[PDB]
Amino acid sequence: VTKPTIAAVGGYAMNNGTGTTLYTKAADTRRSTGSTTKIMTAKVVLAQSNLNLDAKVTIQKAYSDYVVANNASQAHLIVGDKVTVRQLLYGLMLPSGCDAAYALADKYGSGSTRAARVKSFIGKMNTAATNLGLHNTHFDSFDGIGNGANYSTPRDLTKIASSAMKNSTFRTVVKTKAYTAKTVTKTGSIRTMDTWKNTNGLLSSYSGAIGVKTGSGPEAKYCLVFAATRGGKTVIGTVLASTSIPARESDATKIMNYGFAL
């Protein structure tokens, strides 16, 4: 059809299976990523050699005080509770839990203090980007809150998502609309947390939708990394700095419809 007009200042889409570019709009112009940064955190974790999805992590007061201070989005994890790595991945990706991101960084970074392990974890995120051969991506935080040193591009981010989608656990989490965690309490009892719902509205509005993660920030504005399959063909892409929640959703709908019609 005809190229669609979108509100996002940055946009990109490709055939996930072949790598062929389908849509472009300032595809290689660097911008702030906000919470879309959490896609890489999940990717690094899932690639750890010492990965055990059933391993349990104790929620520290630090994770809790962190979201309060930066008034970040959270999964409402309760300090004292024991949560598995698998549950933390759902907490990170669905409601966009920055408290979960912190817990994952602290667990998989290497070092003797929490401060040292987060530093090491962020170093791992950048190494992963270099290994993907990226040139316009740099991380300064494990969640996207950090600073102006936290940037990427619509093309770079799409390649990061495509790489993560190669992991079945990642694909499973990302297409999940709702998840309810049953955690272990400080005294040993089982707690049913309030249900977590995925912030990505395409999972319900766009048929074939299968991913992947919304994002936002004071500088990043409204972002979304999307993916969908139809006729055995899957297009994956990114939209950076759209003007609102609904606008970001139609931007992506428009790009995907165009990509499938090419």
Side-chain angles (χ1 to χ4, degrees), residues 98-195:
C98 276
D99 38 351
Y102 199 166
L104 288 165
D106 186 13
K107 162 67 148 180
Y108 288 111
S110 117
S112 295
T113 61
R114 177 171 313 117
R117 295 189 293 269
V118 290
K119 273 295 145 297
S120 147
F121 191 82
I122 296 163
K124 292 191 177 188
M125 291 168 76
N126 286 306
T127 290
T130 292
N131 282 4
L132 273 186
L134 275 17
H135 298 289
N136 299 293
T137 297
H138 181 69
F139 304 103
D140 207 47
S141 66
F142 54 69
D143 50 9
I145 287 179
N147 62 182
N150 216 85
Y151 62 81
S152 190
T153 66
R155 191 193 301 264
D156 270 20
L157 230 18
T158 297
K159 294 224 198 142
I160 285 165
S162 171
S163 168
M165 285 294 262
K166 270 159 175 235
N167 179 285
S168 62
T169 298
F170 185 91
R171 291 199 307 273
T172 291
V173 172
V174 135
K175 57 170 181 237
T176 298
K177 311 182 204 108
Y179 184 86
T180 301
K182 264 143 264 254
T183 184
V184 165
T185 233
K186 201 173 192 171
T187 58
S189 83
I190 293 322
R191 183 208 309 288
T192 296
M193 278 182 72
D194 306 297
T195 300

Coordinates of all heavy atoms in Angstrom, one line a residue, residues 98-195:
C98 N 10.5 -1.8 37.9 CA 11.8 -1.4 38.1 C 12.4 -2.0 39.4 O 13.6 -2.1 39.5 CB 11.9 0.1 38.1 SG 12.0 0.9 36.5
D99 N 11.5 -2.5 40.3 CA 12.0 -3.1 41.5 C 12.5 -4.5 41.1 O 13.5 -5.0 41.7 CB 10.9 -3.2 42.6 CG 9.5 -3.5 42.1 OD1 9.2 -3.5 40.8 OD2 8.6 -3.8 42.9
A100 N 11.8 -5.1 40.2 CA 12.3 -6.4 39.7 C 13.6 -6.3 38.9 O 14.5 -7.1 39.1 CB 11.2 -7.1 38.8
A101 N 13.7 -5.2 38.1 CA 14.9 -5.0 37.3 C 16.2 -4.9 38.3 O 17.2 -5.4 38.0 CB 14.8 -3.7 36.5
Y102 N 16.0 -4.2 39.4 CA 17.0 -4.1 40.4 C 17.4 -5.4 41.0 O 18.6 -5.7 41.2 CB 16.5 -3.1 41.5 CG 17.5 -2.5 42.4 CD1 17.2 -1.4 43.2 CD2 18.9 -2.9 42.4 CE1 18.2 -0.8 44.0 CE2 19.8 -2.3 43.2 CZ 19.5 -1.2 44.0 OH 20.4 -0.6 44.7
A103 N 16.4 -6.2 41.3 CA 16.6 -7.5 41.9 C 17.4 -8.4 41.0 O 18.3 -9.2 41.4 CB 15.2 -8.2 42.2
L104 N 17.1 -8.3 39.7 CA 17.8 -9.1 38.7 C 19.2 -8.6 38.4 O 20.1 -9.5 38.3 CB 17.0 -9.1 37.3 CG 15.7 -9.9 37.3 CD1 14.8 -9.5 36.1 CD2 16.0 -11.4 37.3
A105 N 19.4 -7.3 38.5 CA 20.8 -6.8 38.3 C 21.7 -7.2 39.5 O 22.8 -7.6 39.3 CB 20.7 -5.2 38.3
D106 N 21.1 -7.1 40.7 CA 21.9 -7.4 41.9 C 22.2 -8.9 41.9 O 23.3 -9.3 42.4 CB 21.0 -7.0 43.1 CG 21.7 -7.2 44.4 OD1 22.9 -7.4 44.5 OD2 21.0 -7.2 45.5
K107 N 21.3 -9.7 41.4 CA 21.5 -11.2 41.4 C 22.6 -11.7 40.4 O 23.4 -12.5 40.7 CB 20.2 -11.9 41.2 CG 20.3 -13.3 40.8 CD 20.9 -14.2 41.9 CE 20.4 -15.6 41.8 NZ 20.9 -16.5 42.9
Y108 N 22.5 -11.1 39.2 CA 23.4 -11.6 38.2 C 24.7 -10.8 37.9 O 25.5 -11.2 37.0 CB 22.6 -11.8 36.9 CG 21.8 -13.1 37.1 CD1 20.4 -13.0 37.1 CD2 22.4 -14.3 37.2 CE1 19.6 -14.1 37.4 CE2 21.6 -15.5 37.4 CZ 20.2 -15.4 37.5 OH 19.5 -16.5 37.8
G109 N 24.8 -9.6 38.5 CA 26.1 -8.9 38.3 C 27.1 -9.6 39.2 O 26.7 -10.4 40.1
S110 N 28.4 -9.4 38.9 CA 29.4 -10.0 39.7 C 30.1 -9.0 40.7 O 30.4 -7.9 40.3 CB 30.4 -10.7 38.8 OG 31.7 -10.2 38.9
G111 N 30.3 -9.4 41.9 CA 30.9 -8.5 42.9 C 30.5 -8.8 44.3 O 29.5 -9.6 44.5
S112 N 31.1 -8.2 45.3 CA 30.9 -8.4 46.7 C 29.9 -7.5 47.4 O 29.5 -7.8 48.5 CB 32.2 -8.5 47.5 OG 33.0 -9.5 47.1
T113 N 29.5 -6.4 46.7 CA 28.5 -5.5 47.2 C 27.4 -5.3 46.2 O 27.6 -5.6 45.0 CB 29.1 -4.1 47.6 OG1 29.6 -3.5 46.4 CG2 30.2 -4.3 48.6
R114 N 26.3 -4.9 46.6 CA 25.2 -4.6 45.6 C 25.6 -3.6 44.6 O 25.4 -3.8 43.4 CB 23.9 -4.2 46.4 CG 22.7 -3.8 45.5 CD 21.5 -3.6 46.3 NE 21.3 -4.6 47.3 CZ 21.3 -4.4 48.6 NH1 21.5 -3.2 49.1 NH2 21.2 -5.5 49.5
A115 N 26.3 -2.5 45.1 CA 26.7 -1.5 44.3 C 27.7 -2.0 43.2 O 27.6 -1.6 42.0 CB 27.4 -0.4 45.1
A116 N 28.6 -2.9 43.6 CA 29.5 -3.5 42.6 C 28.8 -4.4 41.6 O 29.2 -4.4 40.4 CB 30.6 -4.3 43.4
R117 N 27.8 -5.1 42.0 CA 27.2 -6.0 41.1 C 26.3 -5.3 40.1 O 26.2 -5.7 38.9 CB 26.3 -7.1 41.9 CG 27.2 -8.0 42.7 CD 26.4 -9.1 43.3 NE 25.4 -8.7 44.3 CZ 25.7 -8.6 45.6 NH1 26.9 -8.9 46.1 NH2 24.7 -8.1 46.4
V118 N 25.7 -4.2 40.5 CA 24.9 -3.4 39.5 C 25.8 -2.8 38.4 O 25.5 -2.8 37.2 CB 24.0 -2.3 40.2 CG1 22.9 -2.9 41.0 CG2 24.9 -1.4 41.0
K119 N 27.0 -2.3 38.9 CA 27.9 -1.7 38.0 C 28.4 -2.8 37.0 O 28.4 -2.5 35.8 CB 29.1 -1.2 38.7 CG 29.0 0.2 39.2 CD 28.9 1.2 38.1 CE 28.0 2.4 38.5 NZ 26.6 1.9 38.7
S120 N 28.6 -4.0 37.5 CA 29.1 -5.1 36.6 C 27.9 -5.5 35.7 O 28.2 -5.9 34.5 CB 29.5 -6.3 37.5 OG 29.2 -7.5 36.8
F121 N 26.7 -5.4 36.1 CA 25.6 -5.8 35.3 C 25.4 -4.9 34.1 O 25.1 -5.3 33.0 CB 24.3 -5.9 36.1 CG 23.1 -6.5 35.4 CD1 23.0 -7.9 35.3 CD2 22.2 -5.8 34.7 CE1 22.0 -8.5 34.6 CE2 21.2 -6.4 33.9 CZ 21.1 -7.8 33.9
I122 N 25.5 -3.6 34.4 CA 25.3 -2.6 33.3 C 26.5 -2.8 32.3 O 26.3 -2.6 31.1 CB 25.3 -1.2 33.9 CG1 24.1 -1.0 34.8 CG2 25.3 -0.1 32.8 CD1 24.2 0.2 35.7
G123 N 27.6 -3.2 32.8 CA 28.7 -3.5 31.9 C 28.4 -4.6 31.0 O 28.8 -4.7 29.8
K124 N 27.7 -5.6 31.5 CA 27.3 -6.8 30.8 C 26.2 -6.4 29.7 O 26.2 -7.0 28.6 CB 26.6 -7.8 31.7 CG 27.6 -8.5 32.7 CD 26.9 -9.7 33.3 CE 27.9 -10.4 34.3 NZ 27.4 -11.7 34.8
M125 N 25.4 -5.4 30.0 CA 24.4 -5.0 29.0 C 25.1 -4.4 27.8 O 24.7 -4.6 26.6 CB 23.4 -4.0 29.6 CG 22.5 -4.6 30.7 SD 21.6 -3.3 31.6 CE 20.4 -2.8 30.4
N126 N 26.1 -3.6 28.0 CA 26.8 -2.9 27.0 C 27.6 -3.9 26.1 O 27.8 -3.8 24.9 CB 27.7 -1.8 27.5 CG 27.0 -0.6 28.0 OD1 26.2 0.0 27.2 ND2 27.2 -0.2 29.3
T127 N 28.2 -4.9 26.8 CA 29.0 -5.9 26.1 C 28.1 -6.7 25.2 O 28.4 -7.0 24.1 CB 29.6 -6.9 27.1 OG1 30.7 -6.3 27.9 CG2 30.2 -8.1 26.4
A128 N 26.8 -7.0 25.6 CA 25.9 -7.7 24.8 C 25.6 -6.9 23.5 O 25.4 -7.5 22.5 CB 24.6 -7.9 25.6
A129 N 25.5 -5.6 23.7 CA 25.2 -4.7 22.5 C 26.3 -4.7 21.5 O 26.0 -4.8 20.3 CB 24.9 -3.3 23.0
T130 N 27.5 -4.7 22.0 CA 28.7 -4.8 21.1 C 28.8 -6.1 20.4 O 29.1 -6.2 19.2 CB 30.0 -4.6 22.0 OG1 30.0 -3.2 22.5 CG2 31.2 -4.8 21.1
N131 N 28.4 -7.2 21.1 CA 28.5 -8.5 20.5 C 27.4 -8.6 19.4 O 27.6 -9.5 18.5 CB 28.2 -9.5 21.6 CG 29.4 -9.8 22.5 OD1 30.5 -9.1 22.3 ND2 29.3 -10.8 23.4
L132 N 26.4 -7.8 19.5 CA 25.4 -7.8 18.4 C 25.8 -6.9 17.3 O 25.1 -6.8 16.3 CB 24.1 -7.3 19.0 CG 23.1 -8.3 19.7 CD1 21.8 -7.6 20.0 CD2 22.9 -9.5 18.8
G133 N 27.0 -6.2 17.5 CA 27.5 -5.4 16.4 C 26.9 -4.0 16.3 O 26.9 -3.4 15.3
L134 N 26.3 -3.6 17.4 CA 25.5 -2.3 17.4 C 26.5 -1.2 17.6 O 27.6 -1.3 18.1 CB 24.5 -2.3 18.6 CG 23.1 -2.9 18.3 CD1 23.2 -3.8 17.0 CD2 22.7 -3.7 19.5
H135 N 26.2 0.0 17.1 CA 27.0 1.2 17.2 C 26.4 2.4 17.9 O 27.0 3.3 18.4 CB 27.5 1.6 15.8 CG 28.3 0.6 15.1 ND1 29.6 0.2 15.5 CD2 28.0 -0.2 14.1 CE1 30.1 -0.7 14.7 NE2 29.1 -1.0 13.8
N136 N 25.0 2.4 17.9 CA 24.3 3.5 18.5 C 23.5 3.3 19.7 O 22.5 3.9 20.0 CB 23.4 4.1 17.4 CG 24.1 4.6 16.2 OD1 24.9 5.6 16.3 ND2 24.0 3.9 15.1
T137 N 24.0 2.3 20.5 CA 23.4 1.9 21.8 C 24.3 2.0 22.9 O 25.5 1.5 22.8 CB 22.8 0.5 21.7 OG1 21.8 0.4 20.6 CG2 22.2 0.1 23.0
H138 N 23.9 2.6 24.0 CA 24.7 2.7 25.2 C 23.8 2.7 26.4 O 22.8 3.4 26.4 CB 25.6 3.9 25.2 CG 26.4 4.0 26.5 ND1 27.5 3.2 26.7 CD2 26.4 4.8 27.5 CE1 28.1 3.5 27.8 NE2 27.4 4.5 28.4
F139 N 24.2 1.9 27.5 CA 23.4 1.9 28.7 C 24.1 2.4 29.9 O 25.3 2.2 30.1 CB 23.0 0.4 29.0 CG 22.3 -0.2 27.9 CD1 22.9 -1.1 27.0 CD2 20.9 0.0 27.6 CE1 22.2 -1.7 26.0 CE2 20.2 -0.6 26.6 CZ 20.9 -1.5 25.7
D140 N 23.3 3.1 30.7 CA 23.9 3.7 31.9 C 23.1 3.3 33.1 O 23.2 3.9 34.2 CB 23.9 5.2 31.8 CG 25.0 5.9 32.6 OD1 26.1 5.4 32.6 OD2 24.7 6.8 33.4
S141 N 22.1 2.4 32.9 CA 21.3 1.9 34.0 C 20.7 0.6 33.6 O 20.8 0.2 32.5 CB 20.1 3.0 34.2 OG 19.3 3.0 33.1
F142 N 20.1 -0.1 34.6 CA 19.5 -1.4 34.3 C 18.0 -1.3 34.0 O 17.4 -2.3 33.7 CB 19.7 -2.4 35.5 CG 19.3 -1.8 36.8 CD1 17.9 -1.7 37.1 CD2 20.2 -1.5 37.8 CE1 17.5 -1.1 38.3 CE2 19.8 -0.9 39.0 CZ 18.4 -0.8 39.3
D143 N 17.5 -0.1 34.1 CA 16.1 0.1 33.9 C 15.7 1.2 32.9 O 14.5 1.3 32.5 CB 15.4 0.3 35.2 CG 16.0 1.4 36.1 OD1 16.9 2.1 35.6 OD2 15.7 1.5 37.3
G144 N 16.6 2.1 32.6 CA 16.3 3.2 31.8 C 16.1 4.5 32.5 O 15.7 5.5 31.8
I145 N 16.3 4.5 33.8 CA 16.1 5.7 34.6 C 17.4 6.6 34.6 O 17.3 7.8 34.6 CB 15.6 5.4 36.0 CG1 14.2 4.9 36.0 CG2 15.8 6.6 36.9 CD1 13.6 4.5 37.4
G146 N 18.5 5.9 34.6 CA 19.8 6.6 34.7 C 20.0 8.0 34.2 O 19.7 8.9 35.0
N147 N 20.5 8.2 33.0 CA 20.8 9.5 32.5 C 20.8 9.7 31.0 O 20.4 8.8 30.2 CB 22.1 10.1 33.1 CG 23.3 9.3 32.7 OD1 24.4 9.6 33.2 ND2 23.1 8.3 31.9
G148 N 21.4 10.8 30.5 CA 21.5 11.0 29.0 C 22.4 10.1 28.3 O 22.6 10.1 27.1
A149 N 23.1 9.2 29.1 CA 24.0 8.2 28.6 C 23.2 6.9 28.3 O 23.8 5.9 28.0 CB 25.1 7.9 29.5
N150 N 21.9 7.0 28.3 CA 21.0 5.9 28.1 C 20.3 6.1 26.8 O 19.2 6.7 26.7 CB 20.1 5.7 29.2 CG 19.8 4.2 29.5 OD1 20.5 3.6 30.2 ND2 18.7 3.7 28.9
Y151 N 20.9 5.6 25.7 CA 20.3 5.8 24.4 C 20.4 4.6 23.4 O 21.1 3.7 23.7 CB 20.9 7.1 23.7 CG 22.4 6.9 23.4 CD1 22.9 6.2 22.3 CD2 23.4 7.4 24.3 CE1 24.3 6.0 22.1 CE2 24.7 7.3 24.1 CZ 25.2 6.6 23.0 OH 26.5 6.4 22.8
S152 N 19.6 4.7 22.3 CA 19.6 3.7 21.3 C 18.9 4.3 20.1 O 18.6 5.5 20.0 CB 18.9 2.4 21.8 OG 19.1 1.4 20.9
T153 N 18.5 3.4 19.1 CA 17.8 3.8 17.9 C 16.7 2.8 17.6 O 16.7 1.7 18.2 CB 18.7 3.9 16.7 OG1 19.2 2.6 16.3 CG2 20.0 4.8 17.0
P154 N 15.8 3.2 16.7 CA 14.7 2.2 16.4 C 15.2 1.0 15.7 O 14.7 -0.1 15.9 CB 13.8 3.0 15.4 CG 14.1 4.5 15.8 CD 15.6 4.5 16.1
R155 N 16.3 1.1 14.9 CA 16.9 -0.1 14.3 C 17.7 -1.0 15.3 O 17.5 -2.2 15.3 CB 17.8 0.3 13.2 CG 18.3 -0.9 12.3 CD 19.5 -0.6 11.4 NE 19.2 0.5 10.5 CZ 18.7 0.4 9.2 NH1 18.5 -0.8 8.7 NH2 18.5 1.4 8.5
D156 N 18.5 -0.3 16.2 CA 19.3 -1.0 17.2 C 18.4 -1.8 18.2 O 18.7 -3.0 18.5 CB 20.2 -0.1 18.0 CG 21.5 0.2 17.3 OD1 21.7 -0.1 16.1 OD2 22.5 0.6 18.0
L157 N 17.4 -1.2 18.6 CA 16.4 -1.7 19.6 C 15.7 -2.9 19.0 O 15.4 -3.9 19.7 CB 15.5 -0.7 20.1 CG 15.1 -0.4 21.5 CD1 16.2 -0.9 22.5 CD2 15.0 1.1 21.7
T158 N 15.3 -2.8 17.7 CA 14.6 -3.9 17.0 C 15.5 -5.1 16.9 O 15.0 -6.3 17.1 CB 14.2 -3.5 15.6 OG1 13.3 -2.4 15.7 CG2 13.5 -4.6 14.9
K159 N 16.8 -4.9 16.7 CA 17.7 -6.0 16.6 C 18.0 -6.7 17.9 O 18.2 -7.9 18.0 CB 19.1 -5.5 16.0 CG 19.0 -5.0 14.6 CD 20.1 -5.5 13.8 CE 20.3 -4.7 12.5 NZ 21.7 -4.4 12.2
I160 N 17.9 -5.9 19.0 CA 18.1 -6.4 20.3 C 16.9 -7.3 20.7 O 17.0 -8.4 21.2 CB 18.2 -5.3 21.4 CG1 19.5 -4.6 21.3 CG2 18.0 -5.8 22.8 CD1 19.6 -3.2 22.0
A161 N 15.7 -6.8 20.3 CA 14.4 -7.6 20.6 C 14.4 -8.9 19.8 O 14.0 -9.9 20.2 CB 13.2 -6.7 20.2
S162 N 14.8 -8.8 18.5 CA 14.8 -10.0 17.6 C 15.7 -11.0 18.2 O 15.4 -12.2 18.2 CB 15.3 -9.6 16.2 OG 15.5 -10.8 15.4
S163 N 16.9 -10.6 18.8 CA 17.8 -11.5 19.4 C 17.2 -12.2 20.6 O 17.4 -13.4 20.9 CB 19.1 -10.8 19.7 OG 20.0 -11.6 20.6
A164 N 16.5 -11.4 21.5 CA 15.9 -11.9 22.7 C 14.8 -12.9 22.4 O 14.6 -13.9 23.1 CB 15.4 -10.7 23.5
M165 N 14.1 -12.6 21.3 CA 13.0 -13.5 20.9 C 13.4 -14.9 20.5 O 12.6 -15.7 20.2 CB 12.2 -12.8 19.7 CG 11.3 -11.7 20.1 SD 9.9 -12.1 21.2 CE 8.6 -12.3 20.0
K166 N 14.7 -15.1 20.4 CA 15.2 -16.4 20.1 C 15.2 -17.4 21.3 O 15.4 -18.6 21.1 CB 16.7 -16.3 19.6 CG 16.8 -16.1 18.1 CD 18.2 -15.5 17.7 CE 18.4 -15.4 16.2 NZ 19.6 -16.1 15.8
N167 N 14.9 -16.8 22.4 CA 14.8 -17.6 23.7 C 13.3 -17.9 23.9 O 12.5 -16.9 24.1 CB 15.4 -16.8 24.8 CG 15.3 -17.5 26.1 OD1 14.2 -17.6 26.8 ND2 16.4 -18.1 26.6
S168 N 12.9 -19.2 24.0 CA 11.5 -19.5 24.3 C 10.9 -19.0 25.5 O 9.7 -18.7 25.5 CB 11.4 -21.1 24.3 OG 12.2 -21.6 25.3
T169 N 11.7 -18.8 26.6 CA 11.2 -18.3 27.8 C 10.8 -16.8 27.6 O 9.8 -16.4 28.1 CB 12.3 -18.3 29.0 OG1 12.6 -19.7 29.2 CG2 11.7 -17.7 30.2
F170 N 11.6 -16.1 26.9 CA 11.4 -14.7 26.6 C 10.1 -14.6 25.8 O 9.2 -13.7 26.1 CB 12.5 -14.1 25.8 CG 12.4 -12.6 25.5 CD1 12.9 -11.7 26.4 CD2 11.6 -12.1 24.4 CE1 12.7 -10.3 26.3 CE2 11.5 -10.8 24.3 CZ 12.0 -9.9 25.2
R171 N 9.9 -15.4 24.7 CA 8.7 -15.4 23.9 C 7.5 -15.7 24.7 O 6.4 -15.1 24.4 CB 8.9 -16.4 22.8 CG 9.9 -16.1 21.8 CD 9.7 -16.9 20.5 NE 9.6 -18.3 20.7 CZ 10.6 -19.1 20.7 NH1 11.9 -18.7 20.5 NH2 10.4 -20.4 20.9
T172 N 7.6 -16.6 25.7 CA 6.5 -17.0 26.5 C 6.0 -15.8 27.4 O 4.8 -15.5 27.4 CB 6.8 -18.2 27.4 OG1 7.0 -19.3 26.6 CG2 5.8 -18.4 28.5
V173 N 6.9 -15.2 28.1 CA 6.6 -14.1 29.0 C 6.0 -12.9 28.3 O 4.9 -12.5 28.7 CB 7.9 -13.5 29.6 CG1 7.6 -12.2 30.4 CG2 8.6 -14.6 30.5
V174 N 6.6 -12.5 27.2 CA 6.2 -11.4 26.4 C 4.8 -11.4 25.8 O 4.1 -10.4 25.6 CB 7.3 -11.2 25.3 CG1 6.7 -10.9 23.9 CG2 8.1 -10.0 25.8
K175 N 4.2 -12.6 25.5 CA 2.9 -12.7 24.9 C 1.8 -12.9 26.0 O 0.6 -13.0 25.7 CB 2.8 -13.8 23.9 CG 3.2 -15.2 24.4 CD 2.9 -16.2 23.3 CE 3.2 -17.6 23.8 NZ 4.2 -18.3 22.8
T176 N 2.3 -13.0 27.3 CA 1.4 -13.2 28.4 C 0.6 -11.9 28.8 O 1.3 -10.9 29.1 CB 2.2 -13.8 29.6 OG1 2.8 -15.0 29.3 CG2 1.3 -13.9 30.8
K177 N -0.7 -12.0 28.7 CA -1.5 -10.8 29.1 C -1.7 -10.6 30.6 O -1.7 -9.4 31.1 CB -2.9 -10.9 28.4 CG -2.9 -11.2 27.0 CD -4.3 -11.2 26.5 CE -4.5 -12.1 25.2 NZ -5.2 -13.4 25.5
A178 N -1.7 -11.6 31.3 CA -1.9 -11.5 32.8 C -1.2 -12.6 33.5 O -1.0 -13.8 33.0 CB -3.4 -11.6 33.1
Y179 N -0.6 -12.3 34.7 CA 0.1 -13.3 35.4 C -0.1 -13.0 36.9 O 0.0 -11.8 37.3 CB 1.6 -13.3 35.0 CG 2.4 -14.3 35.7 CD1 2.5 -15.6 35.2 CD2 3.1 -14.0 36.9 CE1 3.3 -16.5 35.8 CE2 3.9 -15.0 37.6 CZ 4.0 -16.2 37.0 OH 4.8 -17.2 37.6
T180 N -0.3 -14.0 37.7 CA -0.5 -13.8 39.2 C 0.6 -14.6 39.9 O 0.7 -15.8 39.8 CB -1.8 -14.4 39.7 OG1 -2.9 -13.6 39.0 CG2 -2.0 -14.1 41.2
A181 N 1.5 -13.9 40.6 CA 2.6 -14.5 41.3 C 2.2 -15.0 42.7 O 1.4 -14.3 43.4 CB 3.7 -13.5 41.5
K182 N 2.7 -16.2 43.1 CA 2.4 -16.8 44.4 C 3.8 -16.9 45.0 O 4.6 -17.7 44.6 CB 1.8 -18.2 44.2 CG 0.3 -18.2 44.3 CD -0.3 -19.2 43.3 CE -0.8 -18.5 42.0 NZ -2.2 -18.4 41.9
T183 N 4.1 -15.9 45.9 CA 5.4 -15.8 46.5 C 5.4 -16.5 47.9 O 4.4 -16.8 48.5 CB 5.7 -14.3 46.6 OG1 7.0 -14.2 47.2 CG2 4.7 -13.6 47.5
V184 N 6.7 -16.7 48.4 CA 6.9 -17.2 49.7 C 7.2 -16.1 50.6 O 8.0 -15.2 50.4 CB 8.0 -18.3 49.7 CG1 8.4 -18.6 51.2 CG2 7.6 -19.6 49.0
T185 N 6.5 -16.1 51.8 CA 6.5 -15.0 52.8 C 7.8 -15.1 53.7 O 8.5 -16.1 53.7 CB 5.2 -15.0 53.6 OG1 4.7 -13.7 53.6 CG2 5.5 -15.5 55.0
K186 N 8.0 -14.1 54.5 CA 9.1 -14.0 55.5 C 8.9 -15.2 56.5 O 10.0 -15.7 57.0 CB 9.1 -12.7 56.2 CG 10.4 -12.3 56.8 CD 10.3 -10.9 57.3 CE 11.7 -10.4 57.7 NZ 11.7 -8.9 58.0
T187 N 7.7 -15.5 56.8 CA 7.5 -16.6 57.8 C 7.2 -18.0 57.2 O 6.9 -18.9 57.9 CB 6.3 -16.2 58.7 OG1 5.1 -16.0 57.9 CG2 6.6 -14.9 59.5
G188 N 7.4 -18.0 55.9 CA 7.3 -19.3 55.2 C 5.9 -19.6 54.5 O 5.8 -20.6 53.9
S189 N 5.0 -18.7 54.7 CA 3.7 -18.9 54.1 C 3.6 -18.5 52.6 O 4.5 -17.8 52.1 CB 2.6 -18.2 54.9 OG 2.5 -16.8 54.5
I190 N 2.6 -18.9 51.9 CA 2.5 -18.6 50.5 C 1.5 -17.4 50.3 O 0.5 -17.4 50.9 CB 1.9 -19.8 49.7 CG1 2.9 -21.0 49.7 CG2 1.5 -19.4 48.3 CD1 4.4 -20.5 49.5
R191 N 2.0 -16.4 49.5 CA 1.2 -15.2 49.3 C 0.7 -15.1 47.9 O 1.5 -15.4 46.9 CB 2.0 -14.0 49.7 CG 1.3 -12.7 49.6 CD 2.2 -11.5 49.3 NE 3.3 -11.4 50.2 CZ 3.2 -11.0 51.5 NH1 2.0 -10.7 52.0 NH2 4.3 -11.0 52.2
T192 N -0.5 -14.8 47.7 CA -1.0 -14.6 46.3 C -1.0 -13.1 46.1 O -1.6 -12.3 46.8 CB -2.5 -15.0 46.2 OG1 -2.6 -16.4 46.5 CG2 -3.1 -14.7 44.8
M193 N -0.1 -12.6 45.2 CA 0.0 -11.2 45.0 C -1.2 -10.8 44.1 O -1.9 -11.6 43.5 CB 1.3 -10.9 44.3 CG 2.5 -10.8 45.2 SD 4.0 -10.4 44.4 CE 3.7 -8.7 44.0
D194 N -1.3 -9.5 43.9 CA -2.4 -8.9 43.1 C -1.9 -9.2 41.6 O -0.7 -9.1 41.4 CB -2.6 -7.4 43.2 CG -2.8 -7.0 44.7 OD1 -3.8 -7.5 45.2 OD2 -2.0 -6.3 45.3
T195 N -2.8 -9.6 40.7 CA -2.4 -9.9 39.4 C -1.7 -8.8 38.6 O -2.0 -7.7 38.7 CB -3.7 -10.4 38.6 OG1 -4.2 -11.5 39.2 CG2 -3.3 -10.7 37.2

